[PDB]
């Protein structure tokens, strides 16, 4: 089988938040075979922060909707870490006028991707 590692497994604007401050953070999320980099922006030269697959404890699907109100785009998947419950998914922006028509698979891809890359983590059953 083809043995080649191009690099970043996933890349794209993604928003996330914890269950403490709920400060949804939007930035170019970058996933790799080691960790998930975070670029505050696209133009930026450096990276905002780095999410080591090691930190991740477990990955679950959006089930808890107590944090955000009934009128705020929920999340796709949660990355239970050793600090707080992550909430990665869609961003709060539901309004008429020139609709984008996109926001379903984009997130899904991550749920799986992240899980795949995290396969390296010490999470072995």
Number of domains in the chain: 1
Residue 70 has phi, psi (to 5 degrees) of -70, 5
Give domain status of residue 110, yes or no. yes
Whether 27 and 41 have beta carbons less than 8 Å apart is answered as yes
Q: Bridge-partner residues for 51, per DSSP?
A: 36
**Structural domain containing residue 16:** 8-125
- The CATH number of residue 48's host domain is 2.30.29.30
Residue 46: DSSP 8-state: S
Element (H or E) spanning 88, and its range? strand 88-89
Domain assignment present for 43: yes
In a domain, 2, yes or no: no
CA–CA separation, 53 and 81 (whole Å): 9
Rounded Cα distance, 76 and 88, in Å = 6
Is 70 contained in some domain?
yes
Residue the block writes with tokens 């993604």: 14
**93 occurs within a structural domain:** yes
Asked if residues 58 and 118 have their Cβ atoms less than 8 Å apart, the reply is no
> What is the three-class DSSP state of 60?
strand
């Amino acid at each position: 089988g083809s043995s080649g590692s191009s690099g970043t497994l996933r890349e794209g604007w993604v928003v996330h938040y914890s269950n403490k401050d709920t400060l949804r953070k939007r930035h170019y999320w970058r996933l790799d075979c080691k960790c998930i980099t975070l670029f505050q922006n696209n133009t930026t030269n450096r990276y905002y922060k780095e999410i080591p697959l090691s930190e991740i404890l477990t990955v679950e699907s959006a089930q808890n909707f107590s944090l955000v109100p009934p009128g705020t785009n929920p999340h796709c998947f949660e990355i239970v870490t050793a600090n707080a419950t992550y909430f990665v998914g869609e961003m709060p922006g539901g309004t008429p006028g020139g609709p984008s028509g996109q926001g379903a698979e984009a997130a899904r891809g991550w749920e799986t991707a992240i899980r795949q890359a995290l396969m390296s983590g010490p999470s072995s059953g």
